[model samples]
Target: MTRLLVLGGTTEASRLAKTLADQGFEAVFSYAGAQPLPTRIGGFGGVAGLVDYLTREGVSHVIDATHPFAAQMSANAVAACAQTGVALCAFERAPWTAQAGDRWTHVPDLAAAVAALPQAPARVFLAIGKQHLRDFSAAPQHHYLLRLVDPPEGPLPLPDARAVIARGPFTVQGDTELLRSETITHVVAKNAGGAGAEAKLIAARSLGLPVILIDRPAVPARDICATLEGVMGWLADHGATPRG
Candidate 1:
């Protein structure tokens, strides 16, 4: 009877979903993307739509394992859970921090990250996604190297930009090669601290390049689990045990 809804769209979410399925837990993985699981695609409208889904599906617990930058969905989850009175928790990763070799400039947001870019034309890697590509147009003097999961349908927003069709769980060697080949001088990335995307940072560090790291957007306060074990522990505490 422990039906759960996992609001996903991250590597962490996919990892949790696999564990849930393996443990014979009655769980549905909801995402803005895909995979081989009991999944729901696209938006649940908004807070009201999420509330309706939770009620209709008889979801006993909700775990938000969304991207750190997915502020709107996280906000909606917090609001829907508050209204419905269902148990809610977030399975989120901690933000990445700088190490001894890192040459990092931390910015509060994307706009600030743009401002942090050099005025002189430099080869740059915009490790952030396509959503805010247009924002970088403010500093169009630099050439941009974009790594995207899918090949773009149309032209990119920036004038001096080219896309590399690829997906991550990237490697330092691969990224290092890419940076070297492209002659990249700067990396602009969201501090989306997870193992999957950290290779680029490592690659930049090895090459002695500077990075403009964007801090996470704020979300409403809620129960947060920084690890898989923490997530499982929270579920157990909330009486959402595996069927087996």
Candidate 2:
């Protein structure tokens, strides 16, 4: 059978995996275990480990559907696929654009976001992933309300602004409730474009809260698709057939 390996973490990944399965193709999904992951999870160490898995599992194709800001994992997938001579494609979602009635301050990275916090607002809602929380310590003047899927293991560098341990795909009503309860005036989030965390944006918009949306990093120079359908089409066009 033609086995495909999907480096997945986002909603896109899960959707694509289900699609491939429905099509009767053998699909194996990989996760970094950085956070709570979906089912059928396995960690392939790092770049070398992923390469080994690709070779052993006979992964005919590789789809990198990790988070937009997961630059390291994306890089590893690219290198591993090249090393294994497997066909690779990246499933990248488009970044969110600033719309009317939205107050936005763009930052290149976490450190920049921290430095620009004071200029934006005092009460901050940090929707940025748990991986980059330490960067917030750079700006201690602002009181932060951090939302994460899991609690941090050790002492955090910044003050406990406030921590909400919860997973996403949050509803508009839920998001609004959390924001109102915290009295948040501003929100800090990576422009992770998907339905999972979209309610937060809606809640922020409803309350007229300014959002500091960090843009996504550039992907490697390769055949990239912005949607799941586009990705499958690319594979098909390349004369690659999925096995049952």
Candidate 3:
């Protein structure tokens, strides 16, 4: 018998949760408390406090289906599960590939992505999420147009940054209009590939905006996969039966 703790917040994670729930899997879905969401949903606090939580909850298995750029939790999950001897797996989505007409400048990390910016100031659309918002501060001259899921808590991290609070499942037409309206000449994005936020890349390709893409951070070697089906297999193999 297995009790599971699912680290989730992504579309895939929601699907996994729904399927698990539908099939009567005993799992607790956890989310990073980042937004102004319903207060009823529980939070794990963070990496520092989560190990004790797993012990208290008696969580037998952990599946980290969080956003790819959400490296802190993923890294901490790897460490904590290793210490506790609980089975762990990373449900990592694959990085989007360069298609024709896509002017992608893939960099190794956030710092490298900052280094790739133009020496001159330009209007940039920062699609890398709210976690490392401060990193763009290294490129002070660039004015950033940030689209976030929720309104930022503090002052705009970057001096020249403006924030737009919106949810995703963004469309190409909508994103195209956004880029044009904001005069977004450059796009800085993480390679957290999925259909939701990918419209920006397609829009950029149409308008010929140079995208400074950040590569995935290296996760500790363990069970990792890009698709839900593959992760489902990993779960079944690891002895957690989740039927779709």
Candidate 4:
């Protein structure tokens, strides 16, 4: 019985979920925040909880398809699967690479990225999510342009920040205009690898703007499948095939 558990919080996860449903596989999609195919929202209360759930649910395989920055949950899945002896693999997208005309400054973590910014006030496109906005408060001298998925409810977390309520997959032309119209001088972004969120880097490259790129947080090594085809092949090899 190949019961699959997808630890999901990415576009890749959703894509895989739709594929699994279409293939008539016995799979459950576990989201931190779902639709057809069984969905489980919220956390598993950490590793022990995850172990119990996997055992009780008879989960034969796990795919860690969460965000690259979601380090703790990925680590928990790694530990839980190891303990339960469940087959585990990570469906992680490859990190972005520097190309010609890309003026990039790589930083290990959020703090380093913050520190890498110019001390002198300059317009900055803060391209990360809401969670880390507070940290940028440390360097409030620069004006920040935040592109957010949801509109701001009340006061933004930063003092000199302007919010642009928008979502992606953004286009290079659109982002180029955004940067130009905003008169952005620098960009601060996480190295979250997906086509949806990659336009900003290309836009930056076009405009000759420098980017402060935050490196992906490390997770314990596990089996990885970088493409939908690779994931499907893995599942098929493990006896998760299309129903007739």
Candidate 5:
């Protein structure tokens, strides 16, 4: 049987964990410990630390189902798994595409996304994580609506930004109302391209607003799947124990 360590955090990761538990696969779910309070899952400090755990736990298959934007962690996982000869795979979602009535500005990185903002102060909904909030200070002209899973530990990075602590799978209707309520002139988000966080884009499209979408970071090419069934197939091939 394949002893699995599932690197989790995203909706897909949670779904995979539930499925694995149902099918009785020997799997342990891992969280990166970004949020102060998250679901009950194993946490690790760094890449080498996770690798050490992987080695000591006899983990045969490492499933990196982390957020697509987690480039550093993904790279570290690849390197660590390779060092130990453990199999690794990723469960990621497909990137979102432009549709009718969409005003989307695609940017390759956070720097470009910042540069893409307006010259004058405009109401902006900045959906990127808290780590890059400091860099956005470069665009001080804009009033940012920062969405975070937890409240900021200290002062917010931006002089003209407001914080709202919430979790996702946000609905289009609610997002539409939010955009309307806040009078959000622009939206800045990553091209995460999943159902859980697409409502903002949908609402933006409906509102005839423009979006600056930050492209995903470069990650090593490896076994990747966009669906849960695809993961099950991968598990079966890797000798994952099936339940009755």
Candidate 6:
């Protein structure tokens, strides 16, 4: 049977893995072990480890469906796939575009986003992940409502922030409630364009909150597919099969 390896952590990744399984292909789903990942083979250390796994397990096709911000791991996967001579495809979800009603502020990186925050409103909703939360400490003048899937390792460096431990695919009502209760005037999120994290944008729009959206970094030089269907199509066209 043809074997496939899925570098997955997002909703898209999970969905794609299930799709491959449904297609009667042998598929192994690898996760980064960042949070309580659902139905995955867990972490494989890093690039060297992943390469070892692919070789040992005979993963014929490698698909990267990680978060856009996980550039390092994605790059590692690309290198490992190339070295191992396995077919590779990246399932990158498209970034959200700027809309007219959006008082959107674009920043290049997390540091820039934090610096730009002070110029905006004081009451802020920070949807940036746990990895970059420390940078917010640099701009502590504003009060932040930080959202995360899991709690941080230790106390946050920023004293002006309040943590909200919640997962996304957040409903409009829930988002509205949170924003209204906290009296948030601005939202800060990376343009991780997907349905799962889209509630923040919807809530921000409904409440007339200005958004400081961070732009995505450039994708690596590789076969990149924008949608889930595109990824599967690439695999099929390349005659790559899934493995256990």
Q: How accurate is candidate 2 locally (lDDT)?
A: 0.79
Model 1, which residues run further than 4 Å from truth?
Answer: 33-35
Better of 3 and 6 by TM-score: 6
The prediction achieving the highest lDDT against the true structure is 1
Off by over 4 Å in 3: 34-49, 242-244
The whole-model lDDT of each prediction reads 0.91, 0.79, 0.82, 0.88, 0.84, 0.80
**Residue 103 of model 5, lDDT score:** 97
Candidate 6 local lDDT, 1-244, one digit each (tens):
4687778878888777777777767776777773222345566767798889889988788888889988887888888898899888888778988777767889998888888876544998888767777788787778888888888778877878888988766898899999999999889899998778888888888888899898987656889877867977898898875443
Model 5: lowest-lDDT 10 consecutive positions: 34-43
Q: Cα RMSD for candidate 2?
A: 3.0
Ranking by lDDT: 1, 4, 5, 3, 6, 2
Candidate 5: deviation at residue 70, Å? 0.4
What is the clash count for each candidate, in the order shown? 0, 0, 0, 0, 0, 6
TM of each candidate vs. truth: 0.96, 0.88, 0.88, 0.94, 0.92, 0.89
How high a TM-score does candidate 6 get? 0.89
Judged by lDDT relative to the true structure, which candidate is superior, 5 or 6? 5
Write model 4 residue lDDT over 12-93, tens digit each, in one string: 8888888888888788998786347789989898899999999999998998888899999999999999999998888888
**Which ten contiguous residues of candidate 6 have the minimum total lDDT?**
34-43
lDDT of 3 by residue, 160-230 (tens): 98888888678999999999999999999989888877999999999999999988888777778567777
**lDDT tens readout by residue for model 2, 133-202:** 8888777777889887788787666775888888766899999999999999889889988777788888
Ten contiguous residues with the weakest lDDT in model 2: 34-43
Tell me how far the alpha carbon of residue 184 in candidate 4 is from the true structure, in angstroms, after superposition: 0.8
Query: What is the C-alpha lDDT profile of model 1 across 153-227, one tens digit per residue?
Result: 889999999899897679999999999999999999998888989999999999999999999999999999888
Which residue runs of candidate 2 sit more than 4 Å off their true CA positions?
34-45, 119-121, 239-244
- Which one wins by lDDT: 3 or 5? 5
- Measured over all alpha carbons after superposition, the RMSD of each candidate to the real structure, in angstroms, is 1.3, 3.0, 3.3, 1.6, 2.9, 2.9
Global lDDT for candidate 6?
0.80
* Candidate 6 or 5, higher TM-score: 5
Q: List the candidate 6 regions with Cα displacement exceeding 4 Å.
A: 34-45, 119-121, 242-244
- Between candidates 1 and 2, the one scoring higher on TM-score is 1
The predicted structure with the larger TM-score, 1 or 6, is: 1
